[PDB]
Every structure is written in structure tokens, then in C-alpha cells.
Ligand binder design. Structure first.
Ligand SMILES: NC(=O)c1ccc[n+]([C@@H]2O[C@H](COP(=O)([O-])OP(=O)(O)OC[C@H]3O[C@@H](n4cnc5c(N)ncnc54)[C@H](OP(=O)(O)O)[C@@H]3O)[C@@H](O)[C@H]2O)c1
Ligand SMILES: CCOc1ccc2c(c1)C=C(C(=O)NCc1cc(C(=O)O)c(C)o1)CO2
Length: 315
């Protein structure tokens, strides 16, 4: 299953999440992306930030050489990192991603976050006090540079990530806008279900793409250990038992049935293959209402030290 995007292109509704923390060897991204393609994933989510585009690209090339897939069967996403928001840096950042992945185009290029950072090669530029250094950029000019990347055929589609409604409206209301964002990739799961943003996006034909849909990797660097564990939720577990599925499968199917495209990261061969079973069963309307009741406005990626950024999305 795919969803038609507002530029006429198609996006598979289940995508494979590729982020792994730096303690994971980069050889693993190569191995698990091949396994995901073998399992049936066709939408692969990467980014400059992830330090894995070379390996994800090698996995794609290898499965093309196998004869398993063609390039046109794979939906590959990359993201513009926040130190590259100044408009003259956007196309060179995209070309660099394409060179690492050894691809001629991406299917989707996103602005990774609205929070601009000091330009440079450092992904996390830090001052003498250990504070990450912000930059001020008009994201409408960043967007204009993304539009030129689509016109050049380097990205089939363009979208955003981590935007709130006012940030989306800033793009949608931009004078001389040529391409709307096809999607907004945001944190979305039963403890933070984004119903308000989803209704807004639906009204603008913008696809919401859920990340941390299984509750995040709970990295101690960015997630409070005392936050509740999504997949231990009693309602999700009771529904998994009723359906003879797993809590992860319930969480993924929840998104599919409300019109959300869903990502799922796993570096485990058996859970990768399990997640493709989201297409094998259905939740009832009563099940959906019970999951809708779980929202607690819980942000695993709260970016607490960045709350003072002018573009922090949760203001
Ligand atoms: N645009 C952004 O700012 C942004 C931010 C966050 C994430 N993302 C994208 O979204 C992807 C997914 O989000 P995420 O990394 O936070 O992780 P997630 O999809 O919420 O998954 C969290 C953990 O679930 C476990 N898992 C997967 N399938 C499972 C299953 N069937 N049963 C039990 N546990 C399961 C995985 O562990 P195992 O690996 O051990 O299986 C994974 O570490 C990311 O990789 C990235 O591609 C983007
Ligand atoms: C206003 C400053 O902005 C910055 C600057 C530097 C940063 C961050 C934010 C945040 C980082 C971070 O959250 N890494 C963990 C992670 C990222 C993703 C993803 O998929 O996008 C996943 C699943 O985990 C890296 O260092």
C-alpha cells in the first residue's frame, strides 16, 4: 500500500527507520537495510545526521544487483541537517548525500528540523560553555532552495520534519510557493497521537509521517528513563492479546488506520520481519477509540535543552 502525495508521487505507508546510536557499528546499518528489503520494506528513512547513508545506499545497490528490487521500487528519504539551512548550502548538502549513498536522486528530501544551527561541518556546533550554537534563517528561503532541488530532479518530492502548524502555515502561505511539502515527519504514537496536527495536515493534503511510533529507542542522551515505556502500555498489551499480535504491531496498525504513514526502526532480523505483518490484521473502530484514549502529550524527543530556540516546535 502507498499513499498518493500532493505532487502526484506515491509513498509506501510503512517505512523502515534506520537511525542507530553511534555505539552501533556502521556495518549493522548495511546488514539490516538488506534484511528490511528482503522482508518487504520499500520505504527507507535515512538522513545526513544518521552517519549511515553510505551503508543504506550500499544495501540498496546490493539488493538491486541481486535482482531483488529495482531502484524505482525503493522509496528513499534523506534529510537536510540544520547546519545547512542557509539556502546556498541546501543543494550541496543534497548532492553530498547522493554521493555517499551512490544514488542519482532521493525519493523524498526533508528539512530535518525547523531549528537552524550554526553553519559548518560540525553537526552539533558547541560554544565554550557546551551550548549548541543556534543560527537564524528564514525557512522560506530554505524551502525555496528545496524547490530548486525538486526542479533539478535530485529529489522527487520534498517535505518537512518536526514542524508545528504555524511553521507549516509559514511555508503554505509563502508568496510564490511552487511546491507544498508532501509530508511532515513528526513524533507520533499513542502517548502523543498528534490528532490536532493530523487534522490540520489532512486539510492541506500533507501526509503525516510518524516517527518513534514504537516509543523511541529511549536513548539516555535524549529520553528521560522514567518516561513510560509505550510497548508496556496495558491497553496495547490487551489489544495484542485479543488480536494474537504484538504491542508493536498494534501501535503500527493504529497509525495506518488513521491515515498516518508509519516508520519502524529495528536492527533485529525477527522484529524487522514481524513489523511487515501490520498489513495482516485490522483494528476495530472500538479498538481505535481505546488507543485514542492513551494520549498523554508525552514527547520522547522533547529536546529540552533547545526549548529556548526561537523555532522550537513545542512552544
Ligand atoms: N525526523 C526526525 O527528527 C526523527 C526523529 C526520530 C526518528 N526518526 C526516524 O524514525 C525511525 C523510527 O523511530 P525511532 O528510531 O525512534 O524508533 P521506533 O520506530 O519507535 O522503535 C523503537 C524501538 O522498537 C523496537 N522494535 C521495533 N520493532 C519491534 C517489535 N516488533 N517488537 C518489539 N520492539 C520493537 C526497536 O528495537 P530493535 O532495534 O532492538 O528491534 C526500536 O529500537 C528512526 O530510525 C528515524 O528513521 C526521525
Ligand atoms: C537545536 C539543536 O539541534 C540538535 C543538534 C544536535 C543534535 C540534536 C539536535 C539531536 C540529536 C538527536 O536527537 N540524536 C538522537 C536521534 C536522532 C534521531 C532521528 O532519527 O532524527 C533518532 C531516532 O535519534 C543529535 O544531536
Amino acid at each position: 500500500q502507498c499513499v498518493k502525495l500532493n505532487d502526484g508521487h506515491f509513498m509506501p505507508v510503512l517505512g523502515f527507520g534506520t537511525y542507530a546510536p553511534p555505539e552501533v557499528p556502521r556495518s549493522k546499518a548495511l546488514e539490516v537495510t538488506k534484511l528490511a528489503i528482503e522482508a518487504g520494506f520499500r520505504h527507507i528513512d535515512s538522513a545526513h545526521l544518521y552517519n549511515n547513508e553510505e551503508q543504506v545506499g550500499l544495501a540498496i545497490r546490493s539488493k538491486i544487483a541481486d535482482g531483488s528490487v529495482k531502484r524505482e521500487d525503493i522509496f528513499y528519504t534523506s534529510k537536510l541537517w540544520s547546519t545547512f539551512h542557509r539556502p546556498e548550502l541546501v543543494r550541496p548538502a543534497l548532492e553530498n548525500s547522493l554521493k555517499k549513498a551512490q544514488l542519482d536522486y532521493v525519493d523524498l528530501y526533508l528539512i530535518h528540523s525547523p531549528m537552524s544551527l550554526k553553519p559548518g561541518e560540525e553537526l552539533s556546533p558547541t560554544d565554550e560553555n557546551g551550548k549548541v550554537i543556534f543560527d537564524i534563517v528564514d525557512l522560506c528561503t530554505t524551502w525555496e532552495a528545496m524547490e530548486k532541488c525538486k526542479d533539478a530532479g535530485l529529489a522527487k518530492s520534498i517535505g518537512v520534519s518536526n514542524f508545528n502548524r504555524r511553521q507549516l502555515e509559514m511555508i503554505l502561505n509563502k508568496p510564490g510557493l511552487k511546491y507544498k511539502p508532501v509530508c511532515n515527519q513528526v513524533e507520533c504514537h499513542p502517548y502523543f497521537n498528534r490528532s490536532k496536527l493530523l487534522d490540520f495536515c489532512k486539510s492541506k493534503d500533507i501526509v503525516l509521517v510518524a516517527y518513534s511510533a514504537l516509543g523511541s529507542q529511549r536513548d539516555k542522551r535524549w529520553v528521560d528513563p522514567n518516561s513510560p515505556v509505550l510497548l508496556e502500555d496495558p491497553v496495547l498489551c490487551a489489544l495484542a492479546k485479543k488480536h494474537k499480535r504484538t504491542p508493536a504491531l498494534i501501535a503500527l496498525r493504529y497509525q495506518l488506520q488513521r491515515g498516518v504513514v508509519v516508520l519502524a526502526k529495528s536492527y533485529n532480523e525477527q522484529r524487522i520481519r514481524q513489523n511487515v505483518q501490520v498489513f495482516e490484521f485490522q483494528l476495530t473502530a472500538e479498538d481505535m477509540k481505546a488507543i485514542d484514549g492513551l494520549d498523554r502529550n508525552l514527547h520522547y524527543f522533547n529536546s529540552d535543552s533547545f526549548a529556548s530556540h526561537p523555532n522550537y516546535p513545542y512552544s
